[PDB]
Symmetry: none
Subunit: 467 residues, 4 copies
C-alpha cells in the first residue's frame, strides 16, 4: 500500500506542457507588471475632491481622440463595428465587437465577424491614457459568436459566446444541449489564448434557462464571474406574493402584464452567476449558480463590477424605457450566491421587507427617446455610479453624464461638434479613474435619413470636477 497523491486533471496528461504554460504565464506577468504599476499608481489614489473651496463645483469635459486600439483604427476606415462591449479593470482593457468586412463589396449583408482584443492603458506625455492593443483574436465565421460577454482581468480576457440570446440549460437536455463557446485571450500571443465549446453544468435541476444578451464581469483570483438572468421554479411563490402585495398600490401596469420581458410569459427571472475557473491546472467548466432577490423588470443587461470588500461585487442593471431607475444590488462572489439590494430598490409598503422592487412610472418619464446607457460603478473607496444618456431637450444632440452624489446635482452641456442629427439605437459607456478623474469610454451607433450606412462613433471623454 503506497501513497497516492491526487493531481488535478490536465496536469497528468502533460506535466511538462502544463509547467511550460505556468512558466510562460509567470514570465509574461512579470514583464507586464511595471506597465501595470505605472498605469495604476496615478489611478488608484482617489476620486473625491480633497478640499472644499468654492462649494458648488464646475464640470469641464474634454474629448481625447487618440488611441492605438484596433477598434478605432477600423472605425476610422468607415468599417461597420456594431455591438461593442468593453471592460476596463486591473489596468488592462478588453473589447468584443462584430465586424462587417467592407474591404470587398459583395451583396449587402453576407457575414459578420467577431473580434476580441485585450490591451494596456498607458500615459502619453500629458498624463493621459493611451489605449494600446497588445493582442487580438478573430473567430471563424462558422461559429456561435453572435452574443458574447466581456470580462477582463489579471492580464487575461474571457468570454461566453452563444449564437442564441437565451441558452436552454435544462429544457434541451433530451436533445443536444446548448453549449457556450468560452473564448479566452492572453495579453501576448501564447497558449492562454484558447477557445472551446463546453457543456455548462447546471446549478440544480431547478434552473431551466439562461439569458445572455449584453453582460460584463471581471476576473480576480483566477476566476471569471458574470451575472445573467435565469429561470427557476422555486422563487415563483414568494415573488408572486410580493408582486401581489405591491399590486394594490398605484403600480397597476406592473401586475397587469401577463408576459415578462426576459422570458415570454411564465414566471419571474432569477439572478444567475456564471463562474468560470480560469486556471491552467484544470479544464474549463462554467459553474452556474442562482439566488432569489429583488424583482427584475428588464433583461437587456446585467453587469457585475468589483467592490472594495472581500468577496462581494456590485450588480448593476441598465434602466429601460418605463423603469426610471436601475438596480445596483450587491452580489456575493464566494461559495454561496447572495443578492442584497444595496441601493436603488424601492421597498414596498405593508411588506415583510424580504422582497424589494424597482421604481417605475407611467407618465413621469419624458416622451423623448432619451436613450440611456449602462450605469457604471467607479473603482474607488467612495461609492459613485455613472450613467450616460442621449439628451434631446437642447437644440443640439448631446450626451449627459450623471455622477451621482447626495450633496449636489449639476449637469451642464458643452456643444458636441460631431453630429447634430442623432438616432441612437445603442449606447455603452465604460468608466475608470485616471489621475483623480473620470475617464469614460463611450460607444454609440446612429441611423441616418439617407440610410446608406449607419455610423458607429466611439471616443474617450474626461469630466473634471474642479472646486
Amino acid at each position: 500500500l503506497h501513497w497516492c497523491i491526487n493531481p488535478p486533471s490536465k496536469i497528468k496528461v502533460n506535466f511538462t506542457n502544463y509547467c511550460d504554460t505556468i512558466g510562460i504565464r509567470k514570465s509574461i506577468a512579470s514583464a507586464a507588471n511595471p506597465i501595470l504599476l505605472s498605469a495604476l499608481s496615478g489611478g488608484r489614489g482617489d476620486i473625491f475632491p480633497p478640499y472644499r473651496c468654492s462649494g458648488a463645483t464646475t464640470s469641464v469635459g474634454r474629448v481625447f481622440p487618440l488611441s492605438v486600439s484596433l477598434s478605432m483604427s477600423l472605425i476610422s476606415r468607415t468599417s461597420e463595428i456594431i455591438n461593442m462591449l468593453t471592460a476596463i479593470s486591473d489596468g488592462v482593457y478588453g473589447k468584443t465587437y462584430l465586424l462587417v468586412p467592407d474591404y470587398i463589396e459583395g451583396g449587402f449583408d453576407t457575414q459578420k465577424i467577431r473580434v476580441f482584443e485585450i490591451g494596456f492603458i498607458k500615459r502619453w506625455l500629458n498624463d493621459m491614457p493611451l489605449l494600446q492593443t497588445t493582442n487580438y483574436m478573430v473567430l471563424p465565421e462558422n461559429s456561435k459568436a453572435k452574443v458574447c460577454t466581456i470580462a477582463v482581468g489579471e492580464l487575461t480576457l474571457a468570454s461566453l459566446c452563444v449564437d442564441e440570446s437565451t441558452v436552454l440549460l435544462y429544457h434541451d437536455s433530451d436533445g443536444s444541449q446548448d453549449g457556450i463557446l468560452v473564448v479566452t485571450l492572453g495579453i501576448f500571443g501564447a497558449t492562454p489564448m484558447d477557445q472551446v465549446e463546453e457543456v455548462i453544468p447546471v446549478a440544480h435541476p431547478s434552473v431551466e434557462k439562461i439569458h445572455i444578451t449584453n453582460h460584463r464581469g471581471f476576473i480576480k483570483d483566477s476566476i471569471a464571474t458574470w451575472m445573467v438572468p435565469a429561470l427557476v421554479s422555486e422563487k415563483q411563490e414568494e415573488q408572486k406574493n410580493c408582486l401581489e402585495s405591491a399590486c394594490q398600490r398605484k403600480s397597476y401596469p406592473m401586475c397587469n402584464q401577463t408576459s415578462w420581458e426576459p422570458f415570454g410569459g411564465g414566471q419571474l427571472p432569477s439572478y444567475g452567476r456564471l463562474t468560470l475557473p480560469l486556471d491552467p491546472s484544470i479544464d474549463l467548466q462554467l459553474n452556474i449558480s442562482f439566488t432569489y432577490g429583488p424583482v427584475i423588470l428588464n433583461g437587456d443587461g446585467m453587469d457585475y463590477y468589483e467592490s472594495p470588500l472581500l468577496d462581494s461585487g456590485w450588480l448593476t442593471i441598465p434602466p429601460k424605457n418605463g423603469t426610471v431607475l436601475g438596480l445596483i444590488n450587491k452580489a456575493s462572489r464566494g461559495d454561496q450566491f447572495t443578492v442584497i439590494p444595496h441601493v436603488l430598490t424601492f421597498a414596498p409598503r405593508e411588506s415583510s421587507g424580504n422582497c424589494y422592487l424597482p421604481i417605475q412610472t407611467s407618465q413621469i418619464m419624458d416622451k423623448d427617446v432619451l436613450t440611456e446607457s449602462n450605469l457604471v460603478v467607479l473603482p474607488t473607496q467612495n461609492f459613485r455610479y455613472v450613467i450616460a444618456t442621449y439628451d434631446i431637450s437642447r437644440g443640439d444632440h448631446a450626451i449627459v453624464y450623471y455622477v451621482y452624489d447626495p450633496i449636489r446635482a449639476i449637469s451642464y452641456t458643452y456643444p458636441f461638434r460631431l453630429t447634430t442629427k442623432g438616432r441612437p439605437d445603442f449606447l455603452r459607456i465604460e468608466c475608470f479613474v485616471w489621475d483623480d478623474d473620470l475617464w469614460c469610454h463611450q460607444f454609440y451607433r446612429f441611423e441616418a435619413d439617407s440610410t446608406n450606412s449607419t455610423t458607429s462613433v466611439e471616443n474617450l471623454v474626461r469630466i473634471r470636477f474642479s472646486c
Copy 2:
C-alpha cells in the same frame, strides 16, 4: 501495464504543490517562445514564393493598391493631424520599428515648444483576406535630450536598436578635447519591461585613424545578437590612391566630380570612407560600439547609407540613395565580423586604365530633369533573387503621382501610383521600406509635402502593394 500496486490515500498532513517541482523559464526565452507562432505566420508567407513560376502570357504587368488599415501608433498620430518628422522604418522577419520626431500641437506654448523622439516596435500580423496589419506591441518616448535629434533604426530578433546623436558629425578624438560627442544607445524589447538600455556610450574608436562619424539616416539589422550599421567616416591615412584615381578620371567627361575642392559629407579634406558601427546586444556583456572602417568605391552622396541583410553567411548590401538625380545610387557588398571589406556589386563604374582599386559611381547629367524629383532610398528585397526598389516623386503626371521603379538584373519594371489626391505641395522627405509577403511586394512609405500655406506640412504614411502577374 505494470502498475506499482494498489494505494491508500496518505494522511491529509501532506499537501503537495505541483508548481514547485519544475523550473522557471526566463523572461526573454518565454517572450521569444510566445512570439514565435506570430513570426512563423509571416515567415511562411514570405518564403512561400518569390517570383512567378512561368511566363503564362509571355509578359507581366503590375497591379497596385493602397492598404490604409494599420493599428500602429504612427498612423494613429497622423490621423490626429499631429506633425511627424523624419520617420525611419526597418521591416524585417515580421518585426518592424520606427523612429520619428513628434511636434505636439495640443501643447500650446510660444510658437515652437519641442520635438520628442519616439520609438516603437511590433509585429506584422495576418489580417483577414491575408493582408499585412502592422501592430505595435511596445513603444518608448525619450525625455527631452539633445542627443535624440538624429537616430538610426535596426530591427531584428524581437528587439530594437538605435544610435542617437546630437550633432550630425560625431567627432572621434583621443581622450576629451574640449566638448566631446557621445553616441546615445537605445534598445526596446518586443513586449513589456524586459532588459533594455537607454545608456549614453563613448565610442571605442578601434583603429585611431577614424576622426569623424556622419549619421544622417541609416538602417541596419540585428543578426546573431549583433546590430550593424554603415556610416561614412573621415580617416587621414590612405588618400593618395583615391586622389590619383580622381585625377585620372578628371580628364574624362566626369568633370563636375573632379572639380569639387570640398566634398559633401565632410567639408574639405579627404573624401569619406566606409565605416561600420557594431553593437553586440549580449546582455551579459557590457555594450561596446566597435568601428571597422575600410575604403571602397568613391562616395558622392554621403547623406544616408542603409544596410540590408544578404543570403550569404557574413554579407550585406549597403546602399546609397540617389542625390539630386544627377548621381545614381550604389549597392555595395559589405562583410560582417572581425574583418570588413567592400566589394562593388551594382550601379558601379570601373575606370579604364586605372589603378584598379577605385570604383566610381555612375554620374550622368542627362538624367537630371527640371521636374521636381525626390528619390527615396534603395531597398534590397529579402529574397534570394537580387532585386532593389526605387520610389520617385514626380509631377510630370497630371495626378501628382508617385512612381515605383522595381529593378532586376535582367529587366526593369516601373509602376506609377496615380492614387495621389493632393496635387498642391512639394515633397520634402520621402522614404520607403519594402518587404515580401505572400509572393507579393509591399512597400511601407512615408513622405511630407509643404502646401501653399507655407507653414503646413502634412505627413502622409500608408502601405502600398504592387502585384506582378504572369
Copy 3:
C-alpha cells in the same frame, strides 16, 4: 478505502517528505528528550520511602560512601583545586551546584581571585542502582563585580540564582542614587535560549522592607516560578514582638533577653521572613517580588532553606542550628498571593503570652565543649516529614560525621568512622539528602583546616544510610 491503481510519476516529481509537518520548539524538544531520565529517577526512587511494616521495630543503620561521579566539581576537587562555598540543590531528578572556584596555580597574598561556576545535570543509575551525578551543562562567571554569595534553586530542567556582592542587600537606603541590584543567573539542562544572565532593577512590593540578607539559601522552581526565602528587616513587626520580648525578659529565660543586637543586622529590630519570588518566563517581566510576613523570631539569619511540601501550594522552611543555640527551626510557608508562616515543629510556644510570638528551644548547658559544625536541616521529599541534619563531632575518636535523622516519634543516628584528618577542623559542612530506591542518599561537602595554615581540602562525596527493620 483502497484507491485503485498507480502510474509512475514523471521523473521531475520528487518529494522530500520533510517540509510537511510541525517544527518542535527548543524547550519542548529538550523536555521530551530529557523526560525518560527524570522518569527513571523519580519512579525508581520515590516509590518506596519508609519500611512498610513494623517487623522487629528496632532498626540498625548501615552506611556506605559512593565516590564515583561525573560531576565537574568532583573532578575539580580530585585535581586539588579549592572550592570554598558550594550549594547543591537536588530535586525531581536533576541537580545543580554553585561554588567559588579558586585557581591556586599562581598565588599571591591571600586570594588572587575566586570565580563562580554554576552547573546543572541529571541523576543517573550506574548499573548497581546507585546515583551517578552526571553534569550536562555549566556556566562560569568571571569575578568582575558580583561573585560573593548566591542562592541555588533547581527544578523543571532549569537553574536559578540571585548573586550579590554585598552580604546584605541595601534595598532602600541607596534609593537616593542607584539602589543595589541582584545578578539573576539562569541555566538550562542543555545550551539553549533559557540560559540567560540579566541583572534586574527591583520594583519593591513593600515600602517597609529595606534589607535583604543573601548569604546561603536554597529554593525550588515550581510551575515555572523560582521562589526562595530570605530574612528581611522591617520595623512594624517589632511593635508586636516587643510585648513577647518583655514578657520573656522577666521570665526565668534570661539568655533570651540577654541579647541586645542580632548578627544579621546590627542593632535594629527582629528580622522577618521575606518570600523572594522570580517568575521564570523567557519573554516578559523577569523581576523579583519581596513579600515579608510575621512569624517565629529568628535567632540566626545565617541561612534559610526552602523545601517543597506535599500540600497544594505550601512549602517548608528551615534554619540551620548555630553555635550557642541547641536547635534549628522548621515552620510552614505558603506560596502564591498572600504569604503566611505558621510554625510546624521545633518551636516552643511561651506560656502567658499573647500568641503572636514563638521561641525555639535553647539550653545553655547541654552543649558539649568540642566545636561541632552542623549542616542545614534537610526535608526529605516524601509524604511523611523526616528532617535530617548532619553534625561533625570531635568527641568521638574517629572524627566521624554523625547523621541525626530526626523524627518526632523515633530518633535514629549513624556515625561515619572515615577520614580521620585529626589536624583538620571543618569550616563549612553542607548536605543535600534525597530518597533513592528506598534509601537515604545524602550529598555531603566540607573543608578542613590546617595546623600549617597551608592545607585546605574540600571533600565532596555522596553517602547513603540504610535502615532495615
Copy 4:
C-alpha cells in the same frame, strides 16, 4: 485504457516514514532542535581552533617542542580510572568538537564470587573551553550495554552530534561461511549527543555488495560521520586479489624484503590470500533503516591486521586511510581512499613502487635493524584535520633514560620529537597503546591511552591523560 480522473500518481516514502510519519518527523524535529541548541558550542570550538594552524616562518632556527599534561576532565572514563578500576581497549575519536569513547569496563568496586563479566560502555560528549583556552572533555551522554555484552570488540565513529560503532563478538566476521547455521550479525550501537530518543541498538545482517567478499577483520577501526553517513575501513578477504598480488610479490621479492615472501601465511587471515581493503558505510538517517554495505577495492599489501583508521580529508570525497606499523616494520601506511562512490584506494603516502618492474603495484618499506631487541611500542598514526597534510605517531620505549613516551610529530621537511618523563613506573609493560590528536588554540592536543602492566606487583594499570605539544620558534 485507464480513466485518468480515477487514476493517481503515487510516491514512494522511506520505510520509517510510511509506518509512522508523525513519529518520524517528531524525531526529526527533536534532533534538529537539539542540533540547533548544541550549535553554539561547536561554533565556539571551531572559532577557537581554526586560527593559526602553523607558526610563522622560522625566525632564528628550528622550532622547539613544549609538552604539558592536562589531567582535568569531566569524562566518565577518567572518573572510572581514578577509582582504581581497569579500562580495557578504549578507542577515542575526536572530530568537529565532539568526541566519543568505547571502553571495556571491569567491575571491581562490587565483587560477587570471582568475576561476573566485562561491560562495554559507549560515551559521547563535547569539547569545551575552560576559561584557560584548553579543552574540557565533558560527557553529555553515555550508554552501558547490558550484562550479556554481545559487544566484545567495537569500532568508533563520531560526527554530526552522533556516535556510531559496529560491534562484533569475534575478530573475524564470516559473511558467507556461517550462513549454514546462524549468520554472523553485527551489533550497531548509536547514541545522540543528548536526550533519550536517538539511541538504537540492533543486530543486523550485512548486505555486502558482492559474494566475492567472504571475511572482514574488525579489531580497531576509527572512522568518522559526514553527510549522515558513518564510514569505517577493515581488512577484507577476496579471491581475485591473488592474480595481481602474487605477481607483484614475486616481481618485488628479489629486493631485501625477503621475509615478506618467506611468510607462508598472512597475519590478518591464516593462509588464504592477501588482505584487501574494505569499506563499511552506515547511513545514519531517521528516514532509512540501518544497513551496512561493505565495499572493497585493491591496494598495497596489508602487513598487519591490527586495524585500519579512516580519517577526514579536506577534499570533497577523500579520506586519509591509515594503518599502524607492526613489530619489525618501522613504517606504517597512510593511503588515500574515496567515500560515497565506487571504492577506490590510491596509495598516496608510505608506498614506494619497486623499480625495474611493471609499476602498477606499490609496496611499503621494511627494515628489521631499527627495532633491535628492546620493548618499543608504537601507536596508530593520526592524520590531523589541517590544511597542510600531517601525521603523528607516539612511541613508548625503555631506551629513553626517563622511561618516557616519545611523540614523533612528522613534518614534510623533518621530524620533531618530545619526551614525557612523567613516567615514574620503570616496571611497565605496555599491553595496549593508542593516541588521538586534534588542533585547538594554535597547538597540538593529543589524547593518549597506554594500558601498561606493572611488574612490581603484577597488576595491570590503565593510564590515560591529555597532552599538548607546542612548537615555538
